[PDB]
Write an enzyme that holds these catalytic residues in place. Structure first.
Site, PDB file in Angstrom:
ATOM      1  N   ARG B  66       0.814  -1.203   0.000  1.00  0.00           N
ATOM      2  CA  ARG B  66       0.000   0.000   0.000  1.00  0.00           C
ATOM      3  C   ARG B  66       0.859   1.270   0.000  1.00  0.00           C
ATOM      4  O   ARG B  66       0.381   2.343  -0.356  1.00  0.00           O
ATOM      5  CB  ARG B  66      -0.985  -0.016   1.164  1.00  0.00           C
ATOM      6  CG  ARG B  66      -2.231  -0.825   0.858  1.00  0.00           C
ATOM      7  CD  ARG B  66      -3.176  -0.795   2.037  1.00  0.00           C
ATOM      8  NE  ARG B  66      -2.800  -1.778   3.038  1.00  0.00           N
ATOM      9  CZ  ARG B  66      -3.121  -1.699   4.323  1.00  0.00           C
ATOM     10  NH1 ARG B  66      -3.808  -0.663   4.776  1.00  0.00           N
ATOM     11  NH2 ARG B  66      -2.753  -2.663   5.155  1.00  0.00           N
ATOM     12  N   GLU B 103       0.735  -4.914  13.073  1.00  0.00           N
ATOM     13  CA  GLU B 103      -0.410  -4.977  13.987  1.00  0.00           C
ATOM     14  C   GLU B 103      -1.097  -6.342  14.016  1.00  0.00           C
ATOM     15  O   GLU B 103      -1.474  -6.832  15.085  1.00  0.00           O
ATOM     16  CB  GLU B 103      -1.459  -3.906  13.649  1.00  0.00           C
ATOM     17  CG  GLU B 103      -2.679  -3.989  14.565  1.00  0.00           C
ATOM     18  CD  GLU B 103      -3.730  -2.921  14.313  1.00  0.00           C
ATOM     19  OE1 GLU B 103      -3.620  -2.163  13.324  1.00  0.00           O
ATOM     20  OE2 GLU B 103      -4.684  -2.851  15.121  1.00  0.00           O
TER      21      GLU B 103
END
Ligand SMILES: O=P(O)(O)OC[C@H]1O[C@H](OP(=O)(O)OP(=O)(O)O)[C@H](O)[C@@H]1O
Ligand SMILES: O=P(O)(O)OC[C@H]1O[C@H](OP(=O)(O)OP(=O)(O)O)[C@H](O)[C@@H]1O
Ligand code: HPA
Ligand code: HPA
Ligand SMILES: [Mg+2]
Ligand SMILES: [Mg+2]
Lengths: 174, 179
Positions: B66, B103
């Site tokens: 991304r 995460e």
């Protein structure tokens, strides 16, 4: 020439991972990158006028050109991602590419029926990846106007798998 | 607020419990789909980097995947080249790599050994900073090449995960912050 600025920045790696065409030097030379985006944008403007609604960029190397090309044309970029990456309701499709197999996915609200899209990727080989992307856009009832890439490997006949959808590449190698 | 920042903020969506329960996923897809929003994002980041570094940047480094959505555009906006830091196994030729945690998982990042020469000045860009593990790994690899990492930037920062603290003392900047 502009095309030469792009051509001089493709480097080849025999036997990876196959002669792997590395697009990295194109990205790393700002002049080469602007020439590639400019040539692609100019082509799409000349061929489709103002009939393009969105650019669709293919995860991951397609992400390197999609947004810049979209921006050059005043257009939004939608994302076609490797399966499992996008949140919310999606559609997916499996396929084979030159040196393996994979699956692509798109969010169900990415496009509405009839909307016109140009699909962009860095390189076209067997055409498996681009075809899967077209299939996904098809299920949304989007109209695929054209597929484009920086590099095309002509011996792998990817162009044929996309026909009759128009295809355009800046550079061709056997 | 800056009207430019508002064009970005209004194009972020959230999805609960993707890709695993407990994560609130920030979807940047609408920013890319709205050309005005994307344009504002790049301009805001470019303006920050010009003000902070006075043009003394050699390369932007974009983080797979991304990060690739913003890296080249930001580089172009600044008149700069963009170097790639990728998921391990994707780059040809001699490479260096590092394992890390993000995460909601773990992975390995890689860079080509000739991506940068010693002393070359780099800014790292990614879409989102959460735990900071991904950006930290990128900085670690850039350091192996003896690159000077001047700053890391993202569109979104999730402040409760204290990613910025993990990056210290490398400076960090984000357009948008959420808990
Ligand atoms: O014409 P084909 O035979 O389908 O091959 C072309 C595709 O293969 C590569 O992607 P890859 O799956 O390696 O992932 P990447 O984009 O993350 O490198 C390349 O970037 C194209 O997307
Ligand atoms: O701060 P962290 O905890 O490291 O999280 C942030 C990173 O995680 C996501 O990447 P992801 O690995 O999901 O892959 P993608 O970029 O291909 O979506 C995101 O794009 C950042 O790169
Ligand atoms: O031969 C290749 N080179 C670079 N990228 C590719 N993606 C699929 N096939 C190839
Ligand atoms: O919460 C998140 N949202 C979107 N992308 C991410 N990458 C790591 N964490 C996150
Ligand atoms: Mg690809
Ligand atoms: Mg990422």
């Amino acid at each position: 020439s502009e095309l030469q600025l792009v051509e001089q920045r493709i480097r080849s790696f025999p036997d990876f991972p196959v002669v792997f065409r590395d697009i990295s030097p194109v990205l790393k030379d700002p002049a080469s990158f602007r020439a590639a985006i400019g040539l692609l944008a100019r082509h799409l403007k000349a061929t489709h006028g103002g009939r393009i609604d969105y650019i669709a960029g293919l995860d991951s190397r397609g992400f390197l050109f999609g947004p810049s090309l979209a921006q050059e044309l005043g257009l939004g970029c939608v994302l076609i991602r490797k399966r499992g990456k996008l949140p919310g309701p999606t559609l997916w499709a499996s396929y084979s590419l030159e040196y393996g197999k994979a699956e692509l996915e798109i969010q169900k609200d990415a496009l509405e029926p009839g909307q016109r899209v140009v699909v962009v990727d860095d390189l076209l080989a067997t055409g498996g990846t681009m075809n899967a992307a077209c299939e996904l856009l098809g299920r949304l009832q989007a109209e695929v106007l054209e597929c484009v890439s920086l590099v095309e490997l002509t011996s792998l006949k990817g162009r044929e798998k996309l026909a009759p959808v128009p295809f355009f590449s800046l550079l061709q190698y056997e």
